[PDB]
Amino acid sequence: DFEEIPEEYL
Amino acid sequence: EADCGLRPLFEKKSLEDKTERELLESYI
Amino acid sequence: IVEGSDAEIGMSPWQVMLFRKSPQELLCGASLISDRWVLTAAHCLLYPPWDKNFTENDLLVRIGKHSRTRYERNIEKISMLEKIYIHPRYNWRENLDRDIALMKLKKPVAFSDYIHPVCLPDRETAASLLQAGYKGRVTGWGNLKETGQPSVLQVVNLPIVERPVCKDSTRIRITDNMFCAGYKPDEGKRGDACEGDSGGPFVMKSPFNNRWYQMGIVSWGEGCDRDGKYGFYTHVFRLKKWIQKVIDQFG
Ligand SMILES: Nc1ccc(CNC(=O)[C@@H]2CCCN2C(=O)[C@H](N)Cc2ccccc2)cn1
Ligand SMILES: *[C@@H]1O[C@H](CO)[C@@H](O)[C@H](O)[C@H]1NC(C)=O
Numbered sequence: 001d002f003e004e005i006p007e008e009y010l
Numbered sequence: 011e012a013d014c015g016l017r018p019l020f021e022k023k024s025l026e027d028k029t030e031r032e033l034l035e036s037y038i
Numbered sequence: 039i040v041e042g043s044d045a046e047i048g049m050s051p052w053q054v055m056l057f058r059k060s061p062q063e064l065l066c067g068a069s070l071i072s073d074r075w076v077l078t079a080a081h082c083l084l085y086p087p088w089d090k091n092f093t094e095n096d097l098l099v100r101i102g103k104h105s106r107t108r109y110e111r112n113i114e115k116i117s118m119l120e121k122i123y124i125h126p127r128y129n130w131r132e133n134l135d136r137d138i139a140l141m142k143l144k145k146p147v148a149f150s151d152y153i154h155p156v157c158l159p160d161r162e163t164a165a166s167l168l169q170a171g172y173k174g175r176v177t178g179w180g181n182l183k184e185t186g187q188p189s190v191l192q193v194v195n196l197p198i199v200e201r202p203v204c205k206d207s208t209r210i211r212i213t214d215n216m217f218c219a220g221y222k223p224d225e226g227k228r229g230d231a232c233e234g235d236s237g238g239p240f241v242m243k244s245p246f247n248n249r250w251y252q253m254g255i256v257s258w259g260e261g262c263d264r265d266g267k268y269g270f271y272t273h274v275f276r277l278k279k280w281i282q283k284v285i286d287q288f289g
């Protein structure tokens with residue numbers, strides 16, 4: 001699984 | 011781009027990566 | 039990438055990851071060709087046999103990456119897509135002929151030590167370098183074996199193969215818009231792209247001007263790294279008139 005990316009990028 | 015294909019951490023500082031010579035040796 | 043090795047930091051600063059927004063997962067490789075344009079395989083975006091038909095808002099591009107799964111804070115940059123352009127004669131029905139697509143970014147990406155565009159070949163560079171035996175380099179975060187997934191970007195150098203050998207290795211109809219690469223069984227060495235590496239670049243370092251050129255796009259193979267099989271790559275130069283038409287019209 002992938003680390004969450006910042007929400008700004010949706 | 012005028013600067014395309016020249017890597018900041020390699021060509022731009024005259025450093026070679028560990029296997030690019032293998033490519034060069036194949037270009038006969 | 040099967041039978042490759044970990045990339046060096048900054049080794050492939052044009053590498054792009056195509057990333058699905060939800061569920062968050064790797065979709066494909068891709069390459070940076072300017073501050074606003076990314077090149078990939080058409081089948082990364084459109085493949086009806088598998089019910090694949092992505093729109094711009096489905097996707098992100100992640101540039102500057104090394105780790106597959108980490109959010110590489112202060113290094114990678116994440117861009118939204120303004121528009122996808124698929125080659126109008128892309129043949130998803132039969133053999134992936136003309137397997138090429140462009141993506142325009144919503145905003146220009148800032149270049150850095152980790153983010154930098156690859157050159158596209160002109161006719162003379164392609165004629166000089168696209169010769170049997172000459173090696174290029176393929177990179178990606180795809181499967182490490184045909185039948186897991188890497189911690190960091192993988193790299194393998196592979197020789198271009200003579201067209202009759204490519205043709206004789208498969209029942210699929212090969213076209214002039216494809217070339218194949220890989221070692222032959224009697225050559226000992228191994229390596230191939232694999233599922234997940236789709237859309238990533240096959241690059242060559244010109245010995246004339248010491249610049250990297252993208253000659254191919256990871257397109258297809260039958261299994262991965264099988265003896266007597268080869269990887270097939272979209273022939274970028276052969277489709278460059280379309281690339282230029284899209285960028286000239288929509289840039
Ligand atoms: N060694 C490898 C294996 C896979 C890949 C990534 N690419 C794909 O997976 C594509 C996408 C559509 C299907 N496919 C295949 O490659 C089919 N195995 C063959 C095929 C070829 C042409 C038409 C239909 C089918 C790269 N290198
Ligand atoms: C793919 O998606 C678009 C709609 O977003 C649609 O117009 C098209 O017909 C779909 N199927 C294709 C191109 O095969």
Ligand code: NA
Binds near residue numbers: 245246247
């Ligand atoms: Na020279």
Ligand code: NA
Binds near residue numbers: 230265267
């Ligand atoms: Na093989």
